Design a protein around this nucleic acid. Structure first.
Ligand SMILES: [Mg+2]
Ligand SMILES: [Mg+2]
Ligand SMILES: [Mg+2]
Ligand SMILES: [Mg+2]
Ligand SMILES: [Mg+2]
Ligand SMILES: [Mg+2]
Ligand SMILES: [Mg+2]
Ligand SMILES: [Mg+2]
Ligand SMILES: [Mg+2]
Ligand SMILES: [Mg+2]
Ligand SMILES: [Mg+2]
Ligand SMILES: [Mg+2]
Ligand SMILES: [Mg+2]
Ligand SMILES: [Mg+2]
Ligand SMILES: [Mg+2]
Ligand SMILES: [Mg+2]
Ligand SMILES: [Mg+2]
Ligand SMILES: [Mg+2]
Ligand SMILES: [Mg+2]
Ligand SMILES: [Mg+2]
Ligand SMILES: [Mg+2]
Ligand SMILES: [Mg+2]
Ligand SMILES: [Mg+2]
Ligand SMILES: [Mg+2]
Ligand SMILES: [Mg+2]
Ligand SMILES: [Mg+2]
Ligand SMILES: [Mg+2]
Ligand SMILES: [Mg+2]
Ligand SMILES: [Mg+2]
Ligand SMILES: [Mg+2]
Ligand SMILES: [Mg+2]
Ligand SMILES: [Mg+2]
Ligand SMILES: [Mg+2]
Ligand SMILES: [Mg+2]
Ligand SMILES: [Mg+2]
Ligand SMILES: [Mg+2]
Ligand SMILES: [Mg+2]
Ligand SMILES: [Mg+2]
Ligand SMILES: [Mg+2]
Ligand SMILES: [Mg+2]
Ligand SMILES: [Mg+2]
Ligand SMILES: [Mg+2]
Ligand SMILES: [Mg+2]
Ligand SMILES: [Mg+2]
Ligand SMILES: [Mg+2]
Ligand SMILES: [Mg+2]
Ligand SMILES: [Mg+2]
Ligand SMILES: [Mg+2]
Lengths: 51, 71, 64, 75
RNA sequence: UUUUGUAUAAUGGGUCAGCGACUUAUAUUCUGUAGCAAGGUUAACCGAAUAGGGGAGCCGAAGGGAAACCGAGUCUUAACU
RNA sequence: GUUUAUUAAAAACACAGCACUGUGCAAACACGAAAGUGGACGUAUACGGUGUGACGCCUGCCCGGUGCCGGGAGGUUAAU
RNA sequence: UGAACUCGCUGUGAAGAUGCAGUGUACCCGCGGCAAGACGGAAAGACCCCGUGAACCUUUACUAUAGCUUGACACUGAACA
RNA sequence: CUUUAAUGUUUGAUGUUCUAACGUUGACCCGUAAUCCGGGUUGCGGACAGUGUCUGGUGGGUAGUUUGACUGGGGCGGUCUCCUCCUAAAGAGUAACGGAGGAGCACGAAGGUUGGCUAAUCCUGGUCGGACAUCAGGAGGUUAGUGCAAUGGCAUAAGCCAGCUUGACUGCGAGCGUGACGGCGCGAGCAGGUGCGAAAGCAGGUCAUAGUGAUCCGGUGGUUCUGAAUGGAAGGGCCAUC
């Protein structure tokens, strides 16, 4: 319960994404982690977005 | 509607002309089969000119080594 | 009359050259974010049916 | 009665004993906390599992100032 | 007969004679056996008919892949020591 | 008075009486895919349904719940 | 009504014995009585349980549906306000 | 654009009147020396009523059904999956309505890495300040701590602070463990592309062990893989995911 789930979408590339969990009540701001896009084959800033 | 023609059953029709309908006439492949493909298997003696038919790279080496030119 | 195939089995299996049946792994439709990637990678490629539960598969889909 | 619950057993312990030849990747000891420690040609997994990193025979030894059971492999 | 176990005081049978229970058809796999063999085989059907025609078809001789597709390889993968 | 013919005759059912309630006549209700019958060739002092059970003394409080009756602005809402 | 050449006892054994062990007693065969036993006869226990058995019955169990009821369209029209 | 006036213009719920459909289990005449029925005259309702198709509500009136198992007989009660210890007989495994306890998550810092630190509890002294807040030393030494139960672990710390970060990464995976299977788990090394450190090296989540459910069905993203005459599409498939 509580901790909802989210869809980290790639900025620089296709619609490839990662899914992770996130406690939305404690942390209001959006995740902007740097992760690997395997379509482009490159590290890219994966911005947070809802399912 | 596609068949796997074995190279051993290639030269069993009419000298060296084996397009599709002539191959079908000898009862090597079924009736309702538009596309077909020659693969490697065993033995060519006479020169066979295949045309209007898909052919495999290993077969193409053999059929040319026997003598007959494809298309 | 002829033996009818268990059609549900016909869709979930496929006959190979030796005689065995390839099938798709389970636990890979949904609830995937919590599953580690190392599982999700190993549940992707097709798998041979074990000899223990082959006799069931041979019976329920005899024609190929 | 507030009892009658128990977990599935794990199958822990030693799998390959002293002198036994093992292949690279084979599990030697599958334990919870590092009761056995990694020596020569042995690694420690995230589950605290001792596994072979080369072909050869298993050697159980006791070494170090604090006196602990090290597992090692020699080809 | 059923049972862990029956002389059992558990079941069944008064006796005799007669009848009374793993069959048949079609598919399929496996073993044997006979034929012929990169071939084997015909169904319906026509037939001076349990001959002989009729190979429509089936099965086999190559698989891999969800599939397009490629094919002694191919799938996976951007690509496989 | 009636009742379990064939193990129960009773305190059970019925009963006259009482109350509620429905029914305005092509009645309500019932049987019947319908036509049509009973109700009744009766007409609210009549008919159906429910409960109670001669007679005498009486029958108190609760409308929150469940049903029923009435009200109709608002919210909600099907087909179209 | 399995067949009987169909005794008592204490013990044993499927755990209450005409049949087993040990022992005690008893000439063969009726007839009239009694009814303790032959777990006597009668009814594949009705009690209890079991079956993903059956039926009827109940309800604010699920699902439907006859009837009852609401509306839209039809049979269905003309004027005005 | 707001706000509204007159006219034309397009429709809408109502009410009153009408008669011609419809109704008439109203009266009379005829088929007919027939309470049926039909027809004709004439009253009374009247576009209501009724009947059909669709449609919401109600509906044990009537059907079809379901209503678990374990169980020291059944019912009542309790339990039913996962994790830890014991039972468990020094490898693994091992039952009972045996004995005790927990879980249905948490966290973008509580993950990663690089550099540095080491606890509990007492004792004495010291402002407010006390048995206990903060400070100083000494004794003790890991009796602590480890996001949450218990077990096994941890100083090379897996414990505790600080800086830069996102390896909680994609494709794989020799070879093992473990299950009847479904599955579950460990995993060196290889390819790409990262971060951390001066580099050797480390990182495929968290000290380990619980935090979870198969299939079908359907949704949401990406992929000319298919795509029924052909070209597209819908629908499938494959990959990501609810
Ligand atoms: Mg043919
Ligand atoms: Mg396959
Ligand atoms: Mg497998
Ligand atoms: Mg156990
Ligand atoms: Mg376990
Ligand atoms: Mg005996
Ligand atoms: Mg007997
Ligand atoms: Mg006897
Ligand atoms: Mg018997
Ligand atoms: Mg008998
Ligand atoms: Mg193939
Ligand atoms: Mg009397
Ligand atoms: Mg009578
Ligand atoms: Mg009687
Ligand atoms: Mg009497
Ligand atoms: Mg009597
Ligand atoms: Mg009426
Ligand atoms: Mg009437
Ligand atoms: Mg009448
Ligand atoms: Mg009474
Ligand atoms: Mg009374
Ligand atoms: Mg009302
Ligand atoms: Mg005795
Ligand atoms: Mg006598
Ligand atoms: Mg007598
Ligand atoms: Mg008896
Ligand atoms: Mg019985
Ligand atoms: Mg059952
Ligand atoms: Mg039932
Ligand atoms: Mg009229
Ligand atoms: Mg009439
Ligand atoms: Mg009448
Ligand atoms: Mg009339
Ligand atoms: Mg008329
Ligand atoms: Mg109407
Ligand atoms: Mg019912
Ligand atoms: Mg039970
Ligand atoms: Mg009990
Ligand atoms: Mg043990
Ligand atoms: Mg042991
Ligand atoms: Mg147990
Ligand atoms: Mg460090
Ligand atoms: Mg850490
Ligand atoms: Mg650097
Ligand atoms: Mg289902
Ligand atoms: Mg589908
Ligand atoms: Mg098309
Ligand atoms: Mg799609």
């Amino acid at each position: 319960g509580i901790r909802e789930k989210i869809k980290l979408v790639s900025s620089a590339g296709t619609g490839h994404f990662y899914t992770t969990t996130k406690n939305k009540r404690t942390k209001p701001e959006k995740l902007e982690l740097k992760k690997f896009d395997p379509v482009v084959r490159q590290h890219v800033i994966y911005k947070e977005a809802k399912i | 509607i596609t068949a796997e023609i074995r190279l051993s059953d290639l030269a069993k029709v009419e000298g060296g002309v084996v397009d599709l309908n002539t191959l079908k006439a000898a009862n090597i492949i079924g009736i309702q089969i538009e596309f077909a493909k020659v693969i490697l298997a065993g033995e060519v003696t006479t020169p066979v000119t295949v045309r209007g038919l898909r052919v495999t790279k290993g077969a193409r080496a053999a059929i040319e080594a026997a003598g007959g030119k494809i298309e | 009359p002829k033996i009818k195939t268990v059609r549900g089995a016909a869709k979930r299996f496929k006959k190979t050259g030796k005689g065995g049946f390839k099938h798709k792994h389970a636990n890979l439709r949904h609830i995937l974010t919590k599953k580690a990637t190392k599982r999700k990678r190993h549940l992707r490629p097709k798998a041979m049916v074990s000899k223990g539960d082959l006799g069931l598969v041979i019976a329920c889909l005899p024609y190929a | 009665t507030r009892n009658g619950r128990d977990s599935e057993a794990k199958r822990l312990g030693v799998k390959r004993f002293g002198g036994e030849s093992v292949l690279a990747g084979s599990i030697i000891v599958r334990q919870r906390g590092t009761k056995f420690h990694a020596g020569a040609n042995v690694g420690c997994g995230r589950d605290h599992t001792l596994f072979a990193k080369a072909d050869g025979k298993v050697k159980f030894e006791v070494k170090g100032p604090k006196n602990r059971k090290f597992i090692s492999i020699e080809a």
